[PDB]
Amino acid sequence: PKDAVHLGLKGAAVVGGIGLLFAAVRTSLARKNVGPWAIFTRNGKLAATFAAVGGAYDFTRAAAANLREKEDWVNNGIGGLFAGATMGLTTGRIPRVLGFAALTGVVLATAEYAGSGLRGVFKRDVDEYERKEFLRKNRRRPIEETLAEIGEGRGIKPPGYYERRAQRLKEKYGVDINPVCADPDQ
Amino acid sequence: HEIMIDTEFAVPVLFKLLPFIFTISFSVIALTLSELLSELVIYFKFSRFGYNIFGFFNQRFLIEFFYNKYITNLILNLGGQITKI
Amino acid sequence: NRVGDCFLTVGMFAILWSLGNLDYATVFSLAPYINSNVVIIIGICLLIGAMAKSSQVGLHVWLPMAMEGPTPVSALIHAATMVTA
Amino acid sequence: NVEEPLGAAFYIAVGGIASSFVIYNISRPGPNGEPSSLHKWFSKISDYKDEWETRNTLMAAALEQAAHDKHLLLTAER
Amino acid sequence: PTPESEAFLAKKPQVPPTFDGVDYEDNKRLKQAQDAIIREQWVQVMMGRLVREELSKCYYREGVNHLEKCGKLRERYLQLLANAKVKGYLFEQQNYWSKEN
Amino acid sequence: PKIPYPKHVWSPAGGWYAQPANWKQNTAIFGLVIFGITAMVWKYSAEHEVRHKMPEPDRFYPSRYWVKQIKDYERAQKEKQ
Amino acid sequence: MSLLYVLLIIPIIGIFLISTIDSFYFFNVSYYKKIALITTILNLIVSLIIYILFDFSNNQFQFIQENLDLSFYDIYLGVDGVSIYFVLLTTIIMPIALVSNWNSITNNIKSYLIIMLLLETLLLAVFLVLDVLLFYIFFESILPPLFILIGLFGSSNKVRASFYIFLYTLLGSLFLLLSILTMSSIVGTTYFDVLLKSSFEYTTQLFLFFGIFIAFAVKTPVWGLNSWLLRAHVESPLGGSIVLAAIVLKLSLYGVFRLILPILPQASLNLTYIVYAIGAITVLYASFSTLRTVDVKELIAYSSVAHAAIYLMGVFSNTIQGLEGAILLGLAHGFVSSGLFICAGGILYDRTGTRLIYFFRGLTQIMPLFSLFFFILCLGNAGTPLTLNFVGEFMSLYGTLERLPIAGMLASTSIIFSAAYSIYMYNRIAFGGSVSLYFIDCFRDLTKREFFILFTLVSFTVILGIYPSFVLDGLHYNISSVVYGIEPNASYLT
Amino acid sequence: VVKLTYPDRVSYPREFEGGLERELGGAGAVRAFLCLDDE
Amino acid sequence: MAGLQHYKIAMDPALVRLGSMISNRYKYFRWTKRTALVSFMYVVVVPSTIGYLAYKTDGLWDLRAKRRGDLISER
Amino acid sequence: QYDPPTGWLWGVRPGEKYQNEGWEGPFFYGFWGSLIVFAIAYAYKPDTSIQTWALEEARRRLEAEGILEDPNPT
Amino acid sequence: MYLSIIILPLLGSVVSGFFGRKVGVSGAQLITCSSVIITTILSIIAFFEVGFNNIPVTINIFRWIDSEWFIINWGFQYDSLTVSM
Ligand SMILES: CCCCCCCCCCCCCCCCCC(=O)OC[C@H](COP(=O)([O-])OCC[N+](C)(C)C)OC(=O)CCCCCCCCCCCCCCCCC
Ligand SMILES: CCCCCCCCCCCCCCCCCC(=O)OC[C@H](COP(=O)(O)OCCN)OC(=O)CCCCCCCCCCCCCCCCC
């Protein structure tokens, strides 16, 4: 388990701090003699918007892990989905709320599923020659291994298919399979 | 599925000749209603009951009306939506 | 008629699926033995095709409108031969 | 008083049907199931008794080995 | 039996229709097996086609009496129709199976 | 009366009131062509038809005069006693 | 020298002659077009010779040349039954497409001929290469010439059309390339006779399927990824349109038989319901919008979308008849869409300068020869029996039905709706009153040129509609190799 | 109205020796009435 | 007007203007409740319905050589 | 009363004759000539279809069973 | 004769349609009516051969569609229903 509120606060701080930095650059780059307190008067919304998004991101992903009791890539998706919605909330247009949510959710989930090399990669630390060798000539597999993942039917009828179907049909419809004979003399 | 034996022997004679009795009589009824009467059918036509009956059967149970409204024009409007929206 | 053609095609597809081909001798030699639900699927399918070509109440509207052709067409095509397909 | 000639399309259709009948008849294997003079030529030119299999096998093994070499070079230990 | 034609022998498989004990690095031997599985499926299929042809002749021969005189071909065709199908080699190339399992 | 129409429009079926002066001669050739093709079709049919019962000798069955299957049977059946 | 290399070399020679003959003789542009046409005839003659020698029941690639000089990217050429008919379609279509533009290309004629000749070489190389990465290289190579062809010879909206087809195809192809590169890394090559023996693990297959499917759905195209076609197939010059709909749409279909069926069997079978929902949706949506399309060339372009949905569903049927029917429909679509584009983009457009349906009516009265071929073509588009279109639609539809009945039943509704838009478009143009009162001048009927490109295309669809064995006999053995499955008493013989 | 007033069958169903069982295709196919339950 | 000289056509300005509106209509699409509902129905709902039905009936039935005493159902 | 058959085939007015655009030679003699030749060549092409080979083996196997009569008995 | 019934009306149709300019109005009527009347006589003869003598006639010319299990021929069967129709 994890504290969604506590983790969300840290998320708001990290990205609000970055937003505050970008707020300072806008204030520094102002042309008119506005002053040092332009940080929270003109550009203040920028820092607030950044704190709102990264806080929402860290809250909803932390909450998503707590609700599902799982730690997988999906949680980064809903976190981005909520963070993107918060980004679009500032514009005030419903399509931008959804579209911005979708992009943030998709991008952040895709990065987490594939493990983007932004900070390190999943180092195999194994014999790569043996890995590629095994995948290369694994030409024939046990049939059950295939059947475990595509199943029976749809043209996949391994030997003994009919006996199992006979058994399967009896357990469901309560009917014994006795096909008729086309030859009167039998 | 054989019925022909019962059709030849089991059918009562009244129901065998019933079409001919009806044919030979409604022909008299139809031929008398015209060229002798000719106002009675008119009285029926100019009744609201008869007027509606006449129109409904003249308009073929309104099938072409309902087919055109809810099938043909339905497909054309589906295409209009797909192309435009 | 193409609406009825679509149902006739699925019925042919159902015959092919069950019996391996669609020549008359094969179908009629194996008919007593095939699954009774299969016979219904094929039978209903070829009944709907028959409805359109023989202008039964569901798919009838074309035949009255076919009277727009020259008169010898109505006698030959839409009264005597093709309506009987 | 104008006369309409049969036209070139008449001779293509009639000639094509006549030519199809003639060409089909002369191309038959004859009363016995023996190939004609031209039948033996077409069978001979497109023989390839084992040519495709021989060449295909040689190429498959060569690209097999080439993949082996690249796998060796690409997975070499740093 | 009908003699095996000169053309027929040129395409007759020299290997059994199986993938057991076949070295997949041997290109020639693998393609030989694939050809044998494919050809065997077609033979079973073409067998049904010939049975159907005989059934067709007896139906038009026995007429009313076909329901009684064509049963032997009738049974044969249904058995072939229930069993023969061109399924390819590629499931059996990728999936080995044992009877003792 | 008869409708007016453009004389520049060429149609394979003739056009509007088309009858060439030589229509009988042309009809004779085409009918001859039709006979020739039909005869070829007749020859094919009389050789490739299949029957499973043959007609009785005294019955009106004119195909017995050209169909190969029946002609062979009748010729072979004449060898009796 | 292999006959397959001769196939790729002849058009390059014609390009060389076209670009140099000014130094041996102001040369008339008729000479240029004569060179290009004879170049396509010789390429067709070579493909006919190959087919006469081709063997129908060999699982070895035929007419291959040994290299023994391996490099990083070597062009290996080979042919079997599942590619031989696409090669024939390309070599028959290309001369007809050249004659269809004989008069309508008035400026930059040398550039037009060189692009079409280069297109011939590149499209042929797609069908003949024996390596999966070679397939991508030829598949993508046709884009710059196609971009230039549209932009130099297209109609008023040619810029937007040229950009759409380039960016759509590139975007989809980039997802296919990532799929191909993953295969190349696992197996060590993409040569067919090596990769087809590999057995990718199921999760790898799923993510390989996505990426190859994204590209093939952009190129089919499926409905919703098809606005590039509605632009490019309309704005293109007539010869460009014939090549784009007769051969370029067929690339994704032949691509399924090389890139999905042998190496992704488990992902293909597990995802067929997603493929079938998209193919079913495409069949209905495209049909309804075709019924409301008022640009005559756009209407013929949209019907290509509906037909390609049926061959796509037939190719995922995993049944012999569905797979053969898919190839049969692909070929029949090539003859019919070529003829209908000639009728609209080449006969109506040249005479009127417009493509709007509202201006046409009663053309039969003055153009009987056009209306006769146009009607036969519209029956082919409706899949009328005696055309190769019925044989392909029936076999494709039967395989789709047997694989997934609800998807086949919806796909079958095409028999009703293809008739609807084909008959509706025929009636409004050829029939539907006397000759349109918008025509100030009278119109001449088909010229000899127009007659003999329509007659030739109509000849192919009808002859193959009556004897489709001419293609099926060379398809049966090779197409067996892409089926996935087993019978219980037929498999594992001892 | 028809359901309330439609006559009962006025003849016993026709019977067939052996039910024509062999000539109707054997026990695998459908046969004719033969000393079965009444109707 | 487009390369080769074509025949004189009484090009009706209203019909030409209608043709121009159809080519340029994409430039004026907007998201409204109506357009979003229609777009969602055609793109999501109906396809997902066919997809769900195709999913649930995949492998349900087989007709081949099914006799009396057998079932079309396989699953 | 009937009219004489009229009309300008290929739009050639009755005074003049058809003018060749330059495509007719290659298309009629090269394109169509080659297709006609190929069709004749195709009559003499040997049958290499899987059906022909498989029918012959199927006939022998059904001769082995009591289905087909053996022309060469034992 | 049995094939000649099939192709004779088709032959007249292509002369009437694709060579109308050659035969004109009267030639077209003479060829079509002749080609249909001759077919009708052969049909009456066929009705006696097939129906009265109970000899069905099978005719197969060339295969139409040949795929694994489906073999559809250009083939015709004459039986009692055929000659009745
Ligand atoms: C399915 C594709 C086609 C395969 C079959 C190919 C044709 C086989 C032969 C068909 C019979 C012969 C047709 C003759 C042509 C009709 C008369 C004619 O010349 O038209 C010109 C006529 C000329 O008529 P006109 O001679 O009266 O000239 C004056 C009339 N106007 C004013 C128009 C000039 O053009 C038309 O008026 C009608 C245009 C449409 C033509 C209709 C096509 C006829 C062929 C139908 C094909 C049948 C397919 C069968 C269905 C498939 C089976 C499942
Ligand atoms: C709307 C159109 C629909 C068309 C449907 C397609 C047709 C199917 C329905 C009709 C079937 C009839 C076909 C003809 C059957 C017989 C073919 C034939 O001509 O056979 C004769 C010839 C030699 O016979 P052979 O096979 O050698 O027998 C000995 C074997 N040991 O064998 C040959 O090889 C000769 C081949 C020559 C061509 C055959 C004749 C064609 C007749 C039809 C032509 C119609 C077009 C007319 C064109 C205009 C004519 C004025």
Question: What HEC string does H1-39 produce?
Answer: CCCCCCCCCCCCCCCCHHHHCCCCCCCCCCCCCCCCCCC
How many angstroms from the chain centroid is the CA of residue B34? Answer: 20
Structure tokens at E20: 């057991």
Closest ligand, as measured to the CA of D31: 2
Partner residues linked to K71 by β-bridges: K66
| Cβ count within 10 A of residue A81 | 24
Instruction: Return the closest-CA partner of residue G480 out of K67, F44, K63.
Output: K67
- Residue G483 token pair: 């089926």
Q: Which residues in chain K have their CB less than 8 angstroms from residue J2's CB?
A: 24-25
Strand partners, K62: K74
Rounded to a whole number of angstroms, the distance from the CA of G467 to the nearest CA of chain K is: 6
Instruction: Say if residues G141 and G122 touch (Cβ distance below 8 Å).
Output: yes
What gap in Å lies between CA G396 and CA G388, rounded to an integer? 12
How far apart (Å, rounded) are the C-alpha atoms in residues A56 and A87? Answer: 10
What A72-80 contacts at long range (C-beta under 8 Å, 24+ apart), as own/partner pairs, is A73/A109, A73/A112, A73/A113, A74/A109, A76/A108, A76/A109, A76/A111, A76/A112, A77/A105, A77/A106, A77/A108, A77/A109, A77/A112, A78/A105, A79/A105, A79/A108, A80/A104, A80/A105, A80/A106, A80/A107, A80/A108, A80/A109
Under 8 Å between Cβ of I58 and G272? yes
* Token output for G403: 């694989």
Q: G395 vs G272, G321, G408, CA distance in Å?
A: 18, 5, 11
User: Helices A74-91 and A94-114 meet at what angle, rounded to 10?
Assistant: 150
* Among protein residues, the one whose CA lies closest to atom 40 of ligand 1: G372
Query: Which tokens hold the place of I19?
Result: 């043709």
- Tracing tokens 């699925």 back to the chain, one arrives at C10
Distance from the CA of F41 to the center of ligand 2, in angstroms? 7
Least Cα separation, residue I29 to chain A (angstroms)? 13
Q: Could you tell me the residue range of the domain that residue E33 belongs to? A: 1-101
CA-wise closest residue to E41 among J58, A147, J59: J58
Rg (CA), chain B: 24
Secondary structure of residue E49 in the 3-state scheme: helix
- Per CB-CB distance under 8 Å, the chain K contacts of E42 are 68
Judge whether G68 is closer than 8 Å to chain D, CB to CB: yes
CA distance G464 to K9: 23
Asked whether G381 lines ligand 1 (CB < 6 A), one says: no
Assess A134–D contact: CB distance below 8 Å, yes or no.
no
Taking the centre of ligand 2 as the mean of its atom positions, its distance from the CA of residue G78, in whole angstroms, is: 38
C73: part of which helix (H) or strand (E)?
helix C71-75
Question: How large is the greatest C-alpha to C-alpha distance in chain F, in angstroms?
Answer: 79
A184 contacts in chain E (CB < 8 Å): 67-68, 71
Ligand 2-lining residues (CB < 6 angstroms)? D 13, 17, 20-21, 24; F 33, 37, 40-41, 44; G 466; K 3, 6-7, 10, 14-15, 61, 74
CB A146 within 8 A of CB A154: no
CB contact set of G278 (below 8 Å; sequence gap of 6+): G217, G222, G223, I47
Q: Are G195 and G259 in contact (CB under 8 A)?
A: no
Instruction: Give, in order, the Cα–Cα distances in Å from G104 to each of G109, G154, G353.
Output: 10, 11, 12
Burial bucket for residue I28 (CB in 10 Å: 0-12, 13-18, 19+):
exposed
Kindly list the residues from chain J whose CB atom is less than 8 angstroms away from the CB atom of residue G446. Answer: 10
Q: How far is the CA of G372 from the centre of ligand 1 (A)?
A: 6
End-to-end CA distance of chain I: 65
Mutate to test the pocket of ligand 2, among K4, K7, K15 (most ligand atoms within 8 A of CB): K7
**Identity at B32, one-letter amino acid code:** T
Nearest in space to A152 (alpha carbons), one of A168, A136, A138, A139: A168
Closest to G95 measured CA to CA, from G19, G36, G146, G54: G36
Burial class (CB within 10 angstroms; exposed 0-12, middle 13-18, buried 19+) of I53: middle
Of C29, C35, E56, which Cα lies nearest the Cα of A184? C29
| CB D45 within 8 Å of CB G168 | no
Identity of the residue numbered G16: F
CA–chain centroid gap for G395, Å, is 18
Determine the residue among B4, B6, B15 to mutate to test chain H binding: the one whose Cβ has the most chain H Cβ atoms within 10 Å: B6
The nearest alpha carbon in chain A to E73 belongs to: A183
- Do B10 and H14 lie within an 8 Å CB cutoff? no
Cα G411 off chain centre by: 20
Length in residues, chain A: 186
What b/e readout covers A150-166, taking b as 16+ CB neighbours within 10 angstroms?
bebbbbbbbbebeeebe
* F79/chain J closest Cα distance in angstroms: 25
Cα G171 to Cα G356: distance, rounded to the nearest angstrom: 32
Nearest by Cα to G273 from C10, I3, I55: I55
**Residue nearest atom 48 in ligand 1 by C-alpha distance:** G376
How far is residue G106 CA from its own chain's centroid?
Answer: 27
Residues paired with residue K65 on neighbouring β-strands, in sequence order: K72
Spatial separation of the C-alpha atoms in residues A79 and A54, rounded to whole Å: 9
Q: Which of G237, G178, G225 is CA-nearest to residue G204?
A: G178
Structural domains counted in chain E: 1
Helix axes G368-381, G448-466, angle to 10 degrees: 30
Chain C residues in contact with K85 (beta carbon < 8 A): 84
Distance, in Å, from the CA atom of G265 to the CA atom of G489, rounded to the nearest integer, reads: 22
Question: By what technique were these coordinates determined?
Answer: cryo-EM
Packing angle, helices G143-153 and G132-141, rounded to 10? 10
Beta bridge partners, G295, equal G356
**Residue G13, CB-side half-sphere exposure with 13 Å CA sphere:** 13
* DSSP H helical ranges for chain I: 13-24, 33-40, 46-56
Report the distance separating Cα G478 and Cα E31, nearest Å.
Answer: 12
The reply to whether omega before G221 is within 30° of 0 (cis) is yes
Residue D30 is inside which H or E element, if any? none
CB proximity list for G217: less than 8 A, separation 6 or greater: G172, G225, G278
